[PDB]
Amino acid sequence: MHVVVVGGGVIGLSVAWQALERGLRVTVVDPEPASKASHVSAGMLPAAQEDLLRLCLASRERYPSFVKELEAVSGTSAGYRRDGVLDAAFDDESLAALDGLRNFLAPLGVAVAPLNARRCREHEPMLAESVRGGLLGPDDGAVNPRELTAALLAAIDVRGGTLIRRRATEFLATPGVLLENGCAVHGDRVVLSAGCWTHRLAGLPAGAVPEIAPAKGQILRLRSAAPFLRRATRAVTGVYLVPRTDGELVVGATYEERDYDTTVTAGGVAELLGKVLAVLPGAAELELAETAAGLRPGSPDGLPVLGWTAVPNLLVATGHSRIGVQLAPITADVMGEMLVTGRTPEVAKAFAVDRF
Amino acid sequence: MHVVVVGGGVIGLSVAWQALERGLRVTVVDPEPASKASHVSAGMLPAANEMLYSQEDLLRLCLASRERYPSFVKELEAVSGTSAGYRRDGVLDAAFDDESLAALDGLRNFLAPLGVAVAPLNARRCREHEPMLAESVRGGLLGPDDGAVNPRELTAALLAAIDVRGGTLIRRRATEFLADERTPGVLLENGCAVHGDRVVLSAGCWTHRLAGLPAGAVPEIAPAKGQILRLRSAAPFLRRATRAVTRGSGVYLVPRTDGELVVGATYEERDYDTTVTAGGVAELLGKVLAVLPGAAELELAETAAGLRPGSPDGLPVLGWTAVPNLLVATGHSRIGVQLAPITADVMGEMLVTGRTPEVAKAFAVDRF
Ligand SMILES: Cc1cc2nc3c(=O)[nH]c(=O)nc-3n(C[C@H](O)[C@H](O)[C@H](O)COP(=O)(O)OP(=O)(O)OC[C@H]3O[C@@H](n4cnc5c(N)ncnc54)[C@H](O)[C@@H]3O)c2cc1C
Numbered sequence: 001m002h003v004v005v006v007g008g009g010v011i012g013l014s015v016a017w018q019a020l021e022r023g024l025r026v027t028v029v030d031p032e033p034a035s036k037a038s039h040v041s042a043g044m045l046p047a048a049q050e051d052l053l054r055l056c057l058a059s060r061e062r063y064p065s066f067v068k069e070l071e072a073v074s075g076t077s078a079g080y081r082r083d084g085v086l087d088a089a090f091d092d093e094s095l096a097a098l099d100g101l102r103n104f105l106a107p108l109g110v111a112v113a114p115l116n117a118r119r120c121r122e123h124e125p126m127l128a129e130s131v132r133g134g135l136l137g138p139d140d141g142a143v144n145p146r147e148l149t150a151a152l153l154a155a156i157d158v159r160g161g162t163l164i165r166r167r168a169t170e171f172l173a174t175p176g177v178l179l180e181n182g183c184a185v186h187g188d189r190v191v192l193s194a195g196c197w198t199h200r201l202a203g204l205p206a207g208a209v210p211e212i213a214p215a216k217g218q219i220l221r222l223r224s225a226a227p228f229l230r231r232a233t234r235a236v237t238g239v240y241l242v243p244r245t246d247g248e249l250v251v252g253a254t255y256e257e258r259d260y261d262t263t264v265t266a267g268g269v270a271e272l273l274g275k276v277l278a279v280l281p282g283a284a285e286l287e288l289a290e291t292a293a294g295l296r297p298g299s300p301d302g303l304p305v306l307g308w309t310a311v312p313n314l315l316v317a318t319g320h321s322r323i324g325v326q327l328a329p330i331t332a333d334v335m336g337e338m339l340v341t342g343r344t345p346e347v348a349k350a351f352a353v354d355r356f
Numbered sequence: 357m358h359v360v361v362v363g364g365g366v367i368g369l370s371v372a373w374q375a376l377e378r379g380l381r382v383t384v385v386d387p388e389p390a391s392k393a394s395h396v397s398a399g400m401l402p403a404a405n406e407m408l409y410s411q412e413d414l415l416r417l418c419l420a421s422r423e424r425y426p427s428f429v430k431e432l433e434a435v436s437g438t439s440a441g442y443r444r445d446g447v448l449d450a451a452f453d454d455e456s457l458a459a460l461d462g463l464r465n466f467l468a469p470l471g472v473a474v475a476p477l478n479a480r481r482c483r484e485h486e487p488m489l490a491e492s493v494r495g496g497l498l499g500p501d502d503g504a505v506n507p508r509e510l511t512a513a514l515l516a517a518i519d520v521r522g523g524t525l526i527r528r529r530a531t532e533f534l535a536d537e538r539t540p541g542v543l544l545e546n547g548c549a550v551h552g553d554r555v556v557l558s559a560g561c562w563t564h565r566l567a568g569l570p571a572g573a574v575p576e577i578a579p580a581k582g583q584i585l586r587l588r589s590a591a592p593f594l595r596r597a598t599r600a601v602t603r604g605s606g607v608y609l610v611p612r613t614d615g616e617l618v619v620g621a622t623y624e625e626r627d628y629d630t631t632v633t634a635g636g637v638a639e640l641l642g643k644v645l646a647v648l649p650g651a652a653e654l655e656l657a658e659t660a661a662g663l664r665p666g667s668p669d670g671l672p673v674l675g676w677t678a679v680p681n682l683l684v685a686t687g688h689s690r691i692g693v694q695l696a697p698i699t700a701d702v703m704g705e706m707l708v709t710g711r712t713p714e715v716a717k718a719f720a721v722d723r724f
């Protein structure tokens with residue numbers, strides 16, 4: 001059977017890859033794959049709503065083997081680091097949220113080591129002395145989404161998946177899509193995973209797909225020749241600080257309701273620099289190498305949108321908002337199953353399209 | 357006669373242009389003209405400031421350049437058929453606390469004797485001239501006859517003009533000064549040589565680093581790093597070149613006609629480093645958003661960093677060296693765009709007459 005995946009960010013690429021891994025034939029339609037939210041994304045993979053939590057822990061459990069399998073097929077690196085994740089808090093408010101977080105994670109078998117202010121500074125010398133304590137998640141990490149999507153693209157190629165670099169301009173009642181150049185592509189199944197543009201595809205029957213509203217996020221990248229920070233760090237007052245091996249240090253992110261605007265603004269960059277310098281005062285001399293902005297794919301109730309629509313053979317896989325890099329593997333596994341079996345794995349039932 | 361100008365930022369391009377205008381033949385040596393401090397520069401053309409209070413000679417140099425700027429630009433656009441991006445809509449000096457409002461009183465008294473139009477403005481009048489100022493504005497001064505230039509457009513014109521008048525541009529690095537010959541010259545990185553009747557060094561903070569210079573000839577032109585940024589809106593955000601002071605620190609806000617808004621600048625001692633840093637950009641954004649809170653929505657379009665050419669005593673270095681037929685024209689530090697015209701006029705005279713105009717005597721090389 002043949003599945004057409006509309007949109008090729010981290011969510012359609014992963015989905016398309018796993019569909020191939022399950023012996024399906026796959027076409028991905030996207031004029032510029034891995035160019036949007038997935039391009040600017042930080043790739044923090046923090047452990048962290050019961051249903052969503054369960055979805056995240058499953059994706060978490062799966063991440064290591066997902067990456068292993070992907071590198072094997074692709075002969076490429078996905079840039080997955082498992083050096084643990086440091087949660088650092090700097091005031092009463094934030095130190096209390098850590099207690100809540102640690103209590104939320106103990107029952108579920110997630111390694112979480114509480115750290116007092118001192119222990120925090122020993123794990124990360126570059127933290128400001130105002131640090132009040134933290135949590136260490138030694139089994140967690142972070143990925144470089146740019147490397148992850150590059151691998152997904154390589155793997156999809158190796159397995160003979162087709163990539164069409166054109167815009168899907170219309171959905172056709174088997175299902176298919178019209179492309180901007182006039183050519184058409186039908187398949188046995190169609191999967192929409194076009195981020196915050198999913199619901200904007202002309203020809204979708206009213207009510208089929210809910211509004212995947214964009215949530216803007218500005219983000220920046222600093223650099224030093226040698227890495228500045230020891231490991232993926234969350235500093236709460238939340239700012240995400242993700243060191244790459246080559247000296248890049250990602251700093252995200254703003255969360256904003258600005259429709260589809262992706263302008264990098266004085267306000268946003270000032271917000272981010274303010275946070276990083278408050279908790280990493282030595283970051284003052286790091287080079288500001290990049291500033292960017294992307295759109296998170298939302299949903300009317302803030303949770304992912306996975307499974308069948310009321311339109312036969314039309315599925316969706318979107319609305320991962322703040323954590324799609326994190327949810328990418330489980331989403332891929334889940335949609336694989338759905339396509340092959342016709343049934344919806346238990347862990348995904350909460351995110352059916354029909355709930356609206 | 358033939359003059360070789362080493363270095364082609366705003367100071368050698370202007371100098372070279374005026375030398376041509378005076379019928380000299382001119383060669384400019386610079387691998388990438390107008391690429392350094394002159395590229396990042398804001399182009400504020402302020403009359404005077406706290407810095408000139410205890411510096412009568414420099415003040416006199418600045419006021420002369422100020423007087424000359426309008427006609428300099430007129431003459432340059434005429435020769436070049438190009439715009440230099442000189443705006444004369446006046447300059448707004450805005451203050452935001454007691455400290456800064458008092459410094460304005462001092463500044464207004466400093467400028468009245470020198471024939472500089474300066475209109476005091478109360479907090480209300482400030483907000484009427486510039487609606488985007490924060491409501492904490494405490495009062496200002498308007499300098500209606502002052503303005504600002506876009507250095508990028510100014511150097512483009514200088515380059516066009518120099519071309520039109522048959523000046524030669526050699527896009528190579530001068531690697532060595534050739535001393536002790538009938539005439540002075542420079543060796544280039546590609547091995548070719550260029551002599552002239554006069555040589556003028558105007559290579560910013562690299563001037564003193566040219567191999568072959570006799571010891572003591574040129575003093576240390578030490579770099580002073582400055583980061584600067586550019587914001588943008590489709591329609592202009594700020595009405596005119598604005599200086600805002602608060603909490604004992606200043607920021608320059610220079611609107612261009614196309615919506616670009618320049619915001620400078622940091623002053624830092626980092627030798628020759630021109631890295632744009634988290635610290636520097638945070639400094640600048642902090643200042644602009646404090647006094648222009650609406651600037652939060654503006655696009656951050658560009659960040660940059662440049663090296664100001666300094667001098668052992670902080671004043672320009674103009675005139676002859678102890679090496680015969682070897683002149684210099686550098687060390688303008690924070691205000692070379694402002695001083696560019698007068699510097700050009702002055703060096704023209706020096707080359708043609710052999711004498712040093714009175715206004716420039718204070719900046720002789722030999723003072724060290
Ligand atoms: C600043 C920022 C930081 C983030 N940090 C993290 C983090 O640290 N950890 C984490 O887990 N998550 C993070 N996220 C979230 C995560 O990056 C996103 O949820 C995820 O990238 C969504 O993937 P997606 O493929 O659904 O959408 P996208 O990556 O936006 O991909 C959608 C694709 O659809 C395509 N498309 C659009 N219209 C059409 C059409 N008509 N035809 C064909 N194709 C089309 C586009 O070209 C695009 O490539 C972050 C997001 C942002 C904005």
Ligand SMILES: Cc1cc2nc3c(=O)[nH]c(=O)nc-3n(C[C@H](O)[C@H](O)[C@H](O)COP(=O)(O)OP(=O)(O)OC[C@H]3O[C@@H](n4cnc5c(N)ncnc54)[C@H](O)[C@@H]3O)c2cc1C
Nearest residue numbers: 363365366367394397399400530560582662691692693694
């Ligand atoms: C951030 C910042 C903001 C500023 N804002 C203002 C302002 O608002 N108003 C104002 O008046 N001034 C301002 N200035 C000052 C102004 O930018 C400088 O004083 C002026 O640029 C000095 O220019 P210059 O031509 O001497 O040197 P530069 O512009 O540095 O030019 C020197 C040139 O020499 C060339 N060169 C170097 N070595 C060699 C070699 N061996 N052979 C050949 N060529 C060589 C270089 O390539 C370069 O093009 C600012 C400066 C900075 C850094």
